[PDB]
Design a protein around this ligand. Structure first.
Ligand SMILES: CNC(=O)COC[C@@]1(C(=O)Nc2cncc3ccccc23)CCOc2ccc(Cl)cc21
Ligand SMILES: CNC(=O)COC[C@@]1(C(=O)Nc2cncc3ccccc23)CCOc2ccc(Cl)cc21
Ligand SMILES: [Cl-]
Lengths: 297, 301
């Protein structure tokens, strides 16, 4: 029993974190095989800025060992520093781009040293509500699939509202952001509906049933209601993905949608669900199954 | 900016997780140097659990009865001893991944990271606190026994918890790494219940200071309070008494924000009285009590 916001074990990623220094800027790099990946803002016309840099300008530090940079290239908003040494701790990995609503673990780092690990979701507005201080750029987001690390995020910036923006490991930003000091704002955010439904199923699995009702709803009526509360539309794909949880608890997805509809129109009334007074949207249906079944890595 | 429930990076602990099997019972062990630590109830059957005589059960065991598995390698047990509620299995190999470590016993209100494991394999990492009633509100399924709680301050891992049981309310009880249970719990299936839990007041105050550091000031008021008046109010909401130690501990956060501890106590009194009125503090509609003053300073600064 119990339901916690749980991150993936960070060990396979910890063995990849390095410190990258260029001039006065120090941030984090991800060392995989013989390449160190980091935000290109460590060096704006980035082709013009990069052409002026030589390999020896980039100081890469893996623990108490200085790696030697033997090449450099830019791929979108990520700088790829070719080093002479392949990381012996390189795990089986992939670079994957995630969609809004998908969750991942963040290994927050400062000076190439991991400081903490937390779980978060790619918001529908493409920002992450992370926890990052100055020096955290280059910290990465990931998931683990069996023994394979899927790198999905690299931290680049903090927006004026305190939320965070970054890229995939191919340097493509999530969201309409640019890596430049300029007026940028996170768009109006919405609630990840499929994730709230997954969290309501997790609450049922843990004995919380007070919010259940005899009612059901159509997918169209639920979406008309959900749109009124700044909730993301629920698609038939989401309904299908919630299938296993529906089968395990005996509560049809549209039956749980009627519960969610009543929760949105009437509130919690002094009650909590899994120790929360708000509807939690940073657990995907897969996170719920994984935690309520004990999948290991 | 931002404030998250943050766990320590689990890598140093992952390299210590092993699977311990004794008879039909399989749980997790913590392999440090040439010793594997695990709950002593691994020697029990589901029947033995009611009134086990662990000394009597252990004396009947030999080293080859304990099967220890580190990854795809079977370690050889060369000795065994019991220290309180923890079984210490001496093995023929020192763990090459043994980090710099200490065994520390924590007090209620202290936080730590839990590396939840099943079959000696890490499944997830989460943050939690030792509740005032000495239980932890974890996420543990059957097979999670032996999963450990820790803090990684600097390069040293401080092991503070080992999971042993789930009480009937879905909460968890366990021991320090010397096998001493936290709370009035015993590793028996006799009727046991968690005492009435309370809110960790010093931690809520620390989290209100974290909210101020992050720009949230809506809950502040022009009032102050005496420590005694705050405690009389706090105890009516099942909040732990705030001691002068807690007030002293909150000193740095008070200095950084410019809000005296007794001023922040007056804001807490008002929040307890009014609720949040549709507002949130650091994205929460409840007062968060699983961030200590040390966690807030570490994360915010
Ligand atoms: C040494 N590195 C830095 O100075 C990082 O600052 C980059 C920076 C940024 O916002 N990053 C930061 C990341 N996380 C948390 C932060 C907290 C406080 C201050 C900065 C933070 C500075 C501000 O404007 C831009 C614009 C565009 C890009 Cl792409 C980045 C940035
Ligand atoms: C593999 N399992 C075991 O070795 C036996 O389980 C131990 C057990 C226990 O409570 N463990 C468990 C730990 N965490 C979460 C759990 C969730 C569901 C079921 C069991 C859980 C079984 C029940 O009664 C006792 C009594 C006292 C002690 Cl100290 C332990 C126990
Ligand atoms: Cl302590």
């Amino acid at each position: 029993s119990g339901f916690r916001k749980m991150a993936f074990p960070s060990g396979k990623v910890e063995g990849c974190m390095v410190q990258v220094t260029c001039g006065t800027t120090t941030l984090n790099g991800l060392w995989l095989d013989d390449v160190v990946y980091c935000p290109r803002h460590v060096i704006p016309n980035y082709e013009d800025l990069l052409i002026r840099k030589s390999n020896h300008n980039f100081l890469v530090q893996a623990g108490n060992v200085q790696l030697r940079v033997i090449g450099h290239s830019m791929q979108n908003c990520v700088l790829k520093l070719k080093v002479d040494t392949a990381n012996p701790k390189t795990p089986k990995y992939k670079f994957v781009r995630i969609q809004p609503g998908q969750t991942f673990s963040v290994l927050a780092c400062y000076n190439g040293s991991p400081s903490g690990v937390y779980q978060c979701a790619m918001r529908p507005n493409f920002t992450i509500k992370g926890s990052f201080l100055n020096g955290s750029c280059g910290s990465v987001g990931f998931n683990i699939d069996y023994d394979c690390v899927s790198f999905c995020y690299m931290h680049h910036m903090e927006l004026p509202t305190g939320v965070h923006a970054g890229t995939d490991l191919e340097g493509n930003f999530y969201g309409p952001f640019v890596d430049r000091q300029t007026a940028q704002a996170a768009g109006t955010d919405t609630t990840i509906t499929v994730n709230v439904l997954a969290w309501l199923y997790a609450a049922v699995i843990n004995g919380d049933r007070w919010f259940l009702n005899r009612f059901t709803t159509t997918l169209n009526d639920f979406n008309l209601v959900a749109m009124k509360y700044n909730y993301e539309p629920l698609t038939q794909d989401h309904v299908d993905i919630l299938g296993p949880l529906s089968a395990q608890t005996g509560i049809a997805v549209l039956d749980m949608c009627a519960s969610l509809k009543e929760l949105l129109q009437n509130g919690m009334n002094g009650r909590t669900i899994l120790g929360s007074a708000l509807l939690e949207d940073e657990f995907t249906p897969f996170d719920v199954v994984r935690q309520c079944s004990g999948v290991t890595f």
